[PDB]
Design a protein around this ligand. Structure first.
Ligand SMILES: *[C@@H]1O[C@H](CO)[C@@H](O[C@@H]2O[C@H](CO)[C@@H](O)[C@H](O)[C@H]2NC(C)=O)[C@H](O)[C@H]1NC(C)=O
Ligand SMILES: *[C@@H]1O[C@H](CO)[C@@H](O[C@@H]2O[C@H](CO)[C@@H](O)[C@H](O)[C@H]2NC(C)=O)[C@H](O)[C@H]1NC(C)=O
Ligand SMILES: *[C@@H]1O[C@H](CO)[C@@H](O)[C@H](O)[C@H]1NC(C)=O
Length: 49
């Protein structure tokens, strides 16, 4: 279950998970905006219904 700042996603797949999975939000100084930029959770996704 991940909330990637735009839509709630529920997936049950054979993920090859990273040892340090995370999400990365980048703050842009010039326009003072925060954007979702990094999605480091799974290296692969297969075999799921
Ligand atoms: C959050 O995750 C969802 C699902 O993984 C993303 O929605 C998909 O985005 C891709 C990229 O354009 C589309 O091809 C798919 O059709 C989308 N699925 C839908 C609409 O059901 C969503 O883009 C992700 N959000 C961010 C900011 O990365
Ligand atoms: C995961 O995906 C693999 C890749 O297709 C599947 O491996 C084969 O699946 C077929 C379909 O039943 C079997 O006949 C083969 O014996 C499987 N192994 C090989 C080496 O071909 C695997 O079944 C999938 N697992 C799940 C739970 O969906
Ligand atoms: C802020 O600037 C960056 C880079 O110029 C851009 O990617 C981002 O979309 C901008 N944010 C807004 C809210 O316009």
């Amino acid at each position: 279950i991940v909330n990637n700042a735009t839509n709630v996603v529920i997936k049950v797949c054979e993920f090859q998970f990273c040892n340090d999975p995370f999400l990365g939000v980048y703050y842009h100084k010039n326009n003072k905006s925060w954007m979702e930029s990094e999605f480091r959770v799974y290296s692969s996704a297969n075999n799921c219904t």
